[PDB]
Design a protein around this ligand. Structure first.
Ligand SMILES: [Mg+2]
Ligand SMILES: [Mg+2]
Ligand SMILES: [Mg+2]
Ligand SMILES: [Mg+2]
Ligand SMILES: [Mg+2]
Ligand SMILES: [Mg+2]
Ligand SMILES: [Mg+2]
Ligand SMILES: [Mg+2]
Ligand SMILES: [Mg+2]
Ligand SMILES: [Mg+2]
Ligand SMILES: [Mg+2]
Ligand SMILES: [Mg+2]
Ligand SMILES: [Mg+2]
Ligand SMILES: [Mg+2]
Ligand SMILES: [Mg+2]
Ligand SMILES: [Mg+2]
Ligand SMILES: [Mg+2]
Ligand SMILES: [Mg+2]
Ligand SMILES: [Mg+2]
Ligand SMILES: [Mg+2]
Ligand SMILES: [Mg+2]
Ligand SMILES: [Mg+2]
Ligand SMILES: [Mg+2]
Ligand SMILES: [Mg+2]
Ligand SMILES: [Mg+2]
Ligand SMILES: [Mg+2]
Ligand SMILES: [Mg+2]
Ligand SMILES: [Mg+2]
Ligand SMILES: [Mg+2]
Ligand SMILES: [Mg+2]
Lengths: 56, 150, 48, 142, 103, 110, 117
RNA sequence: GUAACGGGGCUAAACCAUGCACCGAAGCUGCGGCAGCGACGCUUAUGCGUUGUUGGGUAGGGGAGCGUUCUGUAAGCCUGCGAAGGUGUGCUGUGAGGCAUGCUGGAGGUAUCAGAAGUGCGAAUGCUGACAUAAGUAACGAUAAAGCGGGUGAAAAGCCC
RNA sequence: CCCGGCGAGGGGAGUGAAAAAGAACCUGAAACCGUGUACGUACAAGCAGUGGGAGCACGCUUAGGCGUGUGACUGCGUACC
């Protein structure tokens, strides 16, 4: 239920050894607008794979 | 300590240390365990031990040439400037002047001089005889002190 | 003979015991009272 | 001056062949542990493997006295309750002959990393052939 | 070229030009000591083993240094018994420079 | 040139803000801004604003060269914690900690 | 005459904490833990001033035995031969010679073999 | 779980006898050093070329010291050419500790000999404050339920329409 | 003046002996938490030290088996009250 001993600074860091975040392995570039975006996502200006399928 | 006699918490059942008083000396803001009262620090000196030390001190001032003796120690008007010249002409800076009779002009003239103290023969104390570098005693003061102590 | 060259006679000023001030002193912990009885207790002691 | 300590970068380890045919297991095992440890060397430093590499041939023909061929029992536990497993000397000789000398020598070596490290220099073979001819090993009679 | 000698309850294996640190000697820094009770002399091939001592063996050494060694703390502690004792220690030494070995 | 930017008393624990700061340690500032733009953490919004400010300081108060800059030193420090009372069952009061952080970014062209 | 304890208390704690450098965890950081690790180290050291003398002699003897065994004689007989030969070279110096001067050691062995013959 | 030599292994590396060697402790000796208790010739407020012996230790008794704050000595001495405090370093003492010194600090500190004590903390389920841990875990409070468009905005699952 | 939401906060500039006194402000200890560098650590068992001790790093020395940090391997070793 609860600990009989304070775990150390070291055990705490060992637990967190898998807590690092992975970065975006690569951004993709639009063939038409050159914007960087998440792959298979639309751009922030509304482009996906060179086509402007949003109003904005 | 001002506060109540109420038990801060109950004796048993809390995992807390047993307490009884918010004024316990263990506690911050509590009482001092052996709080001081006024007290008289004075000591008994036997009559003979005091005279015995005074005679010893004076003998040691004579051996150390710290006792100066003069017929008289007179400043005419009540001025430091006249006395400071006298002590500069007698080659004296830190000095206890012991006269037989309180001269009003001399007590006043010396009051603003920190290293000078003028006393009557009856005003001697053992510290002031040790504390000052030189002791100047009028001839008539030597008589009084000899009769006091003998 | 000055206010800083006056000693007491040797043997005239004994230290004074301080209880419960550590191991080295020899009066630490129980401070000379031994262990667990009436005599150990604060204000402990049978009457004359 | 401070006494000499061997340095494992400069320590020289020589290669030796040993035959185990007819030799008492324990009597043989002791000399290997001695040599594996480096006790035979004046530069013996017990935190340093000053020892030598030994090849043992013909482990299948190591000898034992008494009725120990049938009655010496090698016990091990698997880590599973009831997993106390047995093997006589002759069943071991039959199934994994190199293990009989390796177990004896491991017991005689220090316990710990250096002891685990000294044990690596023992190369046990069940037959009369080894493949370390390139190491130029010298014959050694125990 | 090396010699074995006893000075301070202990044996030293020394050569010419070796500073050897040994127990305090009642010898000043501007002085030379003669460890004439030498146990061994080796030249590289000629090795004379003192049966007790090398009959003519003598080691001439200059006194370079007196000093106190490195402070070592002595800690005595009896757990659960209200006892602990602390002592410091510095061992005096005499450093000697071996100037000559001679059989 | 080195150029500091700090965000002190940022409403987030150092542990969380650290996860993001570790992604951009020793990186071209162009590359870091793009890691922070597509990293789905509140701490990246906090960290990106600090990195942006450091870039601007390096322009306006120091020399130049957006492209030469790099994330040299980035660290999060624990700031003052705010203390709050959270009522729990049976009159038990738990004092919870609103942990702040001191985010610091250093950026250098050399 | 009220006496604040902070300056002398800090020193008393710092002295122990300095002595606890290199110790793991609370042992180099925390006074309560550190004071126990320093005292123990003292006890072990004191023990180790004696233990070292036993260990070094143990090493010298194993080194002497190896050389002596290499040169043809056990340590036991070898030290008896040097005794009957009146040789007073200590184990520290025999083991140094066994390593650094193998021909000198051979001589000491023949002298021992001689006084046993 | 071998588990009735500590193990390896041993037919001696077992047992019995007969011996000689070695290892083996903080015991003894050797070298150096401190201290206590005696006893000693020169000589003397004795300290030694000396001499002998002792020196594990709870309760506990005896003896001698360290440092802290305050008083006097001190209208002096140190100190903005850098005090206390903090932090390192070096040296030193049998120990408590002490001396010097860099850096920080930015104005007080204090020899010596005496004097007085709120005088030394690791414990008391001690007291107060601060900070950890469990842990980025549990949980975010009724299982009546949300979805989209537009708006505003730095940003809208939660605001407006 | 600049980043930022006419933010919070920060960087410059300026004031000042000092902003390493910026109002969350004299001095600014410790626990605790971090960044950086050196050394070790992924076949290794236990009060985590101690004795021995390689190797590495960094200084020293005019070579010199010494200094600092780390500490593979190894003997001994079950905290305090
Ligand atoms: Mg009060
Ligand atoms: Mg009266
Ligand atoms: Mg006692
Ligand atoms: Mg008790
Ligand atoms: Mg009882
Ligand atoms: Mg009693
Ligand atoms: Mg062992
Ligand atoms: Mg309620
Ligand atoms: Mg069974
Ligand atoms: Mg027998
Ligand atoms: Mg011994
Ligand atoms: Mg003894
Ligand atoms: Mg002696
Ligand atoms: Mg004693
Ligand atoms: Mg004894
Ligand atoms: Mg003050
Ligand atoms: Mg200072
Ligand atoms: Mg405390
Ligand atoms: Mg205690
Ligand atoms: Mg959990
Ligand atoms: Mg869960
Ligand atoms: Mg949940
Ligand atoms: Mg709800
Ligand atoms: Mg909507
Ligand atoms: Mg602003
Ligand atoms: Mg401040
Ligand atoms: Mg601060
Ligand atoms: Mg490994
Ligand atoms: Mg483990
Ligand atoms: Mg062990």
């Amino acid at each position: 239920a609860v600990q009989q001993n304070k775990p150390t600074r070291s055990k705490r860091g060992m637990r967190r050894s898998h807590d690092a975040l992975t970065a975006v392995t690569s951004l993709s570039v639009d063939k038409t607008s050159g914007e960087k975006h998440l792959r298979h996502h639309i751009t922030a200006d509304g482009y996906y794979r060179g086509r402007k399928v949003i109003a904005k | 300590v001002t506060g109540s006699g109420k038990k801060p918490w109950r004796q048993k059942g809390t995992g807390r240390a047993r307490s009884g008083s918010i004024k316990s000396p263990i506690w911050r803001s509590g009482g001092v365990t052996f709080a001081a009262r006024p007290q008289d620090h004075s000591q008994k000196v036997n009559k003979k031990m005091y005279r015995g030390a005074l005679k010893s001190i004076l003998s040691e001032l004579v051996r150390q040439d710290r006792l100066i003796v003069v017929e008289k120690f007179s400043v005419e008007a009540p001025k430091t400037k006249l006395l400071a010249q006298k002590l500069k002409d007698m080659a004296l800076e830190d000095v206890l002047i012991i006269t037989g009779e309180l001269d009003e002009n001399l007590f006043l003239a010396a009051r603003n001089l920190h290293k000078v103290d003028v006393r009557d023969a009856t005003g001697i104390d053992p510290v002031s005889l040790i504390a000052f570098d030189k002791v100047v005693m009028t001839a008539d003061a030597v008589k009084q002190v000899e009769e006091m102590l003998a | 003979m000055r206010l800083n060259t006056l000693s007491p006679a040797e043997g005239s000023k004994k230290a004074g015991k301080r209880l419960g001030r550590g191991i080295g002193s020899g009066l630490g912990k129980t401070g000379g009272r031994g262990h667990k009885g009436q005599k150990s207790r604060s204000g402990g002691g049978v009457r004359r | 001056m401070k006494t000499f300590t061997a340095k494992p970068e400069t320590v020289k380890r020589d290669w030796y062949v040993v035959d185990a045919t007819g030799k008492t297991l324990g009597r043989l095992a002791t000399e290997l542990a001695r040599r594996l440890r480096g006790k035979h060397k004046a530069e013996y430093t017990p935190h340093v493997d000053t020892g030598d590499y030994i090849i043992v041939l013909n482990a299948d023909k190591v000898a034992v006295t008494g009725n120990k061929r049938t009655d010496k029992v090698y016990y091990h536990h698997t880590g599973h309750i009831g997993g106390i497993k047995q093997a006589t000397f002759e069943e071991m000789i039959a199934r994994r002959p190199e293990r009989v000398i390796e177990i004896a020598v491991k017991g005689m070596l220090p316990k710990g990393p250096l002891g685990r490290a000294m044990f690596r220099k023992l190369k046990v073979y069940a037959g009369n052939e080894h493949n370390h001819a390139a190491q130029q090993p010298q014959v050694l009679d125990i | 070229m090396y010699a074995v000698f006893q000075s301070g309850g202990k044996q030293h294996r020394v050569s010419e030009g070796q500073t050897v640190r040994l127990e305090k000697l009642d010898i000043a820094t501007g002085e030379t000591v003669e460890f004439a009770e030498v146990l061994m002399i080796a030249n590289g091939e000629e090795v004379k083993i003192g049966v007790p001592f090398v009959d003519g063996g003598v080691i001439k050494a200059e006194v370079v240094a007196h000093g106190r060694g490195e402070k070592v703390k002595i800690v005595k502690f009896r757990r659960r018994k209200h006892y602990r004792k602390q002592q410091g220690h510095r061992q005096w030494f005499t450093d000697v420079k071996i100037t000559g070995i001679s059989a | 040139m080195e150029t500091i930017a700090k965000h002190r008393h940022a409403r987030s624990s150092a542990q969380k803000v650290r996860l993001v700061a570790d992604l951009i340690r020793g990186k071209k500032v162009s590359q870091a801004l793009d890691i922070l733009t597509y990293t789905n953490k509140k701490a990246a919004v906090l960290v990106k604003k600090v990195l942006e400010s450091a870039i601007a300081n390096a322009e306006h108060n120091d020399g130049a060269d957006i492209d030469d800059l790099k994330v040299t030193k980035i660290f999060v420090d624990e700031g003052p914690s705010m203390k709050r009372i959270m009522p729990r069952a049976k009159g038990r009061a738990d004092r919870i900690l609103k942990r702040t952080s001191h985010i610091t970014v250093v950026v250098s062209d050399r | 005459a009220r006496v604040k304890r902070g300056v002398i208390a800090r020193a008393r704690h710092k002295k122990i904490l300095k002595q606890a450098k290199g110790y793991y965890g609370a042992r180099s950081r925390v006074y309560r833990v550190a004071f126990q690790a320093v005292i123990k180290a003292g006890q072990y050291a004191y023990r180790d001033r004696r233990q070292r003398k036993r260990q070094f002699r143990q090493l010298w003897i194993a080194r002497i035995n190896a050389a002596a065994r290499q040169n043809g004689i056990s340590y036991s007989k070898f030290i008896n031969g040097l005794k009957k030969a009146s040789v007073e070279i200590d184990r520290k110096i025999l083991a140094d010679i066994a390593v650094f001067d193998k021909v000198a050691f051979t001589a000491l062995v023949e002298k021992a073999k001689a006084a046993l013959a």
